[PDB]
Amino acid sequence: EVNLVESGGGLVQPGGSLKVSCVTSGFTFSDYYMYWVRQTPEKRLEWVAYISQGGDITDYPDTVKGRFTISRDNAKNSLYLQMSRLKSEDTAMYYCARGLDDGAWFAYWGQGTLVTVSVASTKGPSVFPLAPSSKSTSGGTAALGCLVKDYFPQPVTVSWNSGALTSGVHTFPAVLQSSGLYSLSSVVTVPSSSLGTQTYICNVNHKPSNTKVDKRVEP
Amino acid sequence: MTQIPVSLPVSLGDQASISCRSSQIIVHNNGNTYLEWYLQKPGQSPQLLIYKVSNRFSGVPDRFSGSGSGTDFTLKISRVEAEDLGVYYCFQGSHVPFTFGSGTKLEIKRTVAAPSVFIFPPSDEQLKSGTASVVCLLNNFYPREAKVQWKVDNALQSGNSQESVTEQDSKDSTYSLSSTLTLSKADYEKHKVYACEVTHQGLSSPVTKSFNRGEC
């Protein structure tokens, strides 16, 4: 199955350089034109570069022309984007995509790799439990969660009971606080009768600061 | 290029239409125009719906159709379904500059649902760290419009809380919101009654969920 896996995204200080990569599979890399598109925080999309299959032709918008460089390694089935002269404005989720012979630009997309251009430093979050109480119990339903506080940059991934508990989960979008750090909450609704018998654990991973913490939530 | 509308609140079974207008004559029937439409569902990468103004990508339901004339290209959705919610984007890839449309947020209208509110007092671990974050959770409601107000000893709090809202739930078309009041252990200690009053269309009277610090 055609797969596009991006990587290399992280925190870079303004003026720095970074090289994100895109490893493909499920199709003959050498036959297609490749692309890099990005989504800014305001959820806006922008095409940032394309490259001929032979690596001979390249093109970029004027917002990125001169600083970014697209490349491909037909042997390693990889696509690259060396970014330079990075500005805050370059902070976005970068995607790699490939055409469709019939006549489409971005038919296949990767998962996206976040690049944050900031002067601030990486911080691991603190995870606090949102313990179930009579204040968090309505009917046969109790609510509980975790507060993943004070971290930079994005993102964090929260899971429950190693992904076993999926229904009733509400992991909210992160909010940037005045401190310049993010904070999010993951919440799950359970039958009040399960409390005290079933184990509820939120798994929090924040690769940038290498943080991984499993917090057991109890009433 | 202009993309209309910005928000498209539609009901199930209803018809929907999204349009993108260029300043130039972009559409060239008989020629070959690369006018495309993408759908991006909550927390997912964008996906190809239609290419070359009217061809559907594999998998895409026939409920989706696209057409265009000179300066305009449109996406028509006959009979909206629940899993159709997300942001729609048109891409103009024939005339340089190749632009993406600003996006259209498709919202599914539904009957009003009142939120169940739960209040979570700060944990000792956080208290031990020096701050106290009290969370108010409005769960599964519609419409998105809701008003959460914090009361500390009957005093209305201002500027010290933050709200977060999830996108619309595909399963039931509801929203969830979260308000966090953050204080320093000091100020937290200085008060007893912590109340969270919510006001939503589904509630005839505003609900107040409170608690007494420590010895409740």
Among B113, B163, B173, B175, smallest CA distance to B136 is for B163
Q: Does A67 touch chain B (CB under 8 A)?
A: no
Assign a CATH topology to domain A1-119: Immunoglobulin-like (2.60.40)
The domain locations on chain B are 1-110, 111-213
Q: Does A104 touch chain B (CB under 8 A)?
A: yes
B2's tokens = 């202009």
Q: Residue B156 and residue B90: Cα distance in Å, rounded?
A: 45
Q: Residue A131 and residue B204: Cα distance in Å, rounded?
A: 29
The sign one gets for the Cα dihedral A208, A72, A24, B97 is positive
A93's tokens = 């989720």
B48's tokens = 């190809």
A74's tokens = 């037909």
Cis bond upstream, residue B61 (ω within 30): no
Measured CA to CA in angstroms, residue A47 lies from A6, A55, A78, B102 at distances of: 16, 18, 19, 13
- B84 burial class (0-12, 13-18, 19+ CB within 10 angstroms)? buried
- Domain B111-213: what homologous superfamily? Immunoglobulins (2.60.40.10)
Q: Report angle CA A198, A199, A204 to the nearest 5 degrees.
A: 145
CA B3 to chain A, closest CA, distance in angstroms equals 13
Q: Do A133 and B116 touch (CB under 8 A)?
A: no
Resolution for this experimental structure (Å): 2.5
Determine the residue among B1, B34, B45 to mutate to test chain A binding: the one whose Cβ has the most chain A Cβ atoms within 10 Å. Answer: B45
Q: For residue B65, what are the β-bridge partners?
A: B76
What's A24's DSSP letter?
Answer: E
Q: Residue B175 and residue B140: Cα distance in Å, rounded?
A: 5
What's A166's DSSP letter?
Answer: -
Same fold, A1-119 and A120-219: yes
Top-level class of domain B1-110: mainly beta
Cis bond upstream, residue A132 (ω within 30): no
Q: Residue B8 and residue B4: Cα distance in Å, rounded?
A: 9
Q: Residue A22 and residue A95: Cα distance in Å, rounded?
A: 8
Q: Does A175 touch chain B (CB under 8 A)?
A: yes
The domain locations on chain A are 1-119, 120-219
A5's tokens = 């896996």
Among A212, A155, A176, A168, smallest CA distance to A194 is for A168
Instruction: Judge whether B108 and A113 are in contact, CB under 8 Å.
Output: no
Residues 6+ apart with CB under 8 A from A61: A46, A47, A48, B97, B98
Q: Report angle CA B134, B135, B140 to the nearest 5 degrees.
A: 165
Residue A11 identity (one-letter amino acid): L
Written in H, E and C, the secondary structure of chain B is CEEECCEEEECCCCCEEEEEECCCCCCCCCCCCCEEEEEECCCCCCEEEEECCCEECCCCCCCEEEEEECCEEEEEECCCCHHHCEEEEEEECCCCCCEECCCEEEEECCCCECCEEEEECCCHHHHHHCEEEEEEEEEEEECCCEEEEEEECCEECCCCEEEEECCCCCCCCCEEEEEEEEEEHHHHHCCCEEEEEEEECCCCCCEEEEEECCCC
Q: For residue B36, what are the β-bridge partners?
A: B91
Q: Does A183 touch chain B (CB under 8 A)?
A: yes
Rg of chain A's alpha carbons, rounded to an integer? 21
Q: For residue B147, what are the β-bridge partners?
A: B199
Beta carbon pairs, A and B, within 8 Å: 133
> Within 13 A of A38's CA, how many CA atoms are on the CB side?
24
E-strand ranges in A3-100 read 3-7, 11-12, 18-25, 34-39, 45-51, 58-59, 69-73, 78-83, 92-100
- Any idea which architecture A120-219 has in CATH? Sandwich (2.60)
Length of chain A counted residue by residue: 219
Q: By what method was this entry solved?
A: X-ray
Nearest CB neighbour to A100, from listed B51, B123, B162: B51
Q: For residue B118, what are the β-bridge partners?
A: B137
What's A136's DSSP letter?
Answer: G
